[PDB]
Write a structure and sequence with these properties.
By secondary structure, the chain is mainly α. It is 22% helix and 3% strand. It has a single domain, classed as Alpha-Beta Complex (Cytochrome C3). It contains three helices and two strands; from the N terminus they run ββααα. The two termini are 30 Å apart. 3% of the residues are buried. The structure holds heme C (HEC) (4 copies). It comes from Desulfomicrobium norvegicum (strain DSM 1741 / NCIMB 8310).
Length: 118
Amino acid sequence: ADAPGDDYVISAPEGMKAKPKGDKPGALQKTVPFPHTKHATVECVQCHHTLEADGGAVKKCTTSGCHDSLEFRDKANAKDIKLVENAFHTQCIDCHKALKKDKKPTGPTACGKCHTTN
Ligand code: HEC
Ligand code: HEC
Ligand code: HEC
Ligand code: HEC
């Protein structure tokens, strides 16, 4: 397939829950701009890890049967790879952090520097 342009924004799937603020209803984080051209050095398959099984078509990470949970991350389900927060954080953050350590061009590691659209 062809990668979308750099104006692309990743947001939470509709219905996505959020940790309540004690007793007050919580809210979602800001959305995340994601520029593919800045990740040209990474093979598509590395992120779109099920590409082959999906026959060359690129499916959204949250599609049914994939990281489809709409449940917020807590202690009880902290290890569940089906969670949106785990799927994206493991992919995005780990690489950025590792590159930062090696002192080379990298992406954001701070919450506010990735969740920006607002
Ligand atoms: C990009 C390099 C990110 C960094 C750094 C952090 N987050 Fe993230 N997060 C990222 C994406 C692409 C997504 C999925 C799309 C979306 O916006 O939902 C997420 C998701 C979350 C969520 C779940 C959804 C929500 O409640 O809004 C949470 C709770 C969240 N991210 C929080 C968060 C915090 C506290 C971070 C700093 C420790 C953080 N994120 C870093 C991408 C990135
Ligand atoms: C990780 C750094 C990635 C690399 C390298 C590439 N893509 Fe990607 N792409 C990535 C994410 C996290 C997303 C959003 C997924 C979601 O569930 O929201 C995307 C999105 C796409 C899409 C559009 C999906 C949609 O909105 O329906 C396409 C078609 C796509 N990506 C194509 C693609 C190709 C061909 C790549 C190599 C040139 C490629 N991506 C690399 C993460 C990453
Ligand atoms: C459904 C066909 C999926 C698509 C599309 C994507 N992922 Fe996925 N992912 C899926 C499964 C079945 C599993 C593994 C089995 C299990 O139960 O754990 C995963 C695993 C990952 C992981 C962990 C990788 C590892 O530990 O080596 C991550 C971090 C992950 N997936 C992220 C991710 C993202 C961001 C996607 C969109 C670009 C994506 N996956 C798509 C199923 C599916
Ligand atoms: C390594 C395998 C990566 C993964 C997984 C993701 N990113 Fe990344 N990102 C990576 C590099 C090497 C760079 C720098 C590229 C360059 O040539 O300078 C980036 C950059 C970003 C940026 C731009 C930040 C800036 O300083 O302007 C953003 C906004 C970004 N990355 C977002 C992002 C998200 C949300 C990811 C998960 C879907 C993600 N990156 C994965 C390397 C890698």
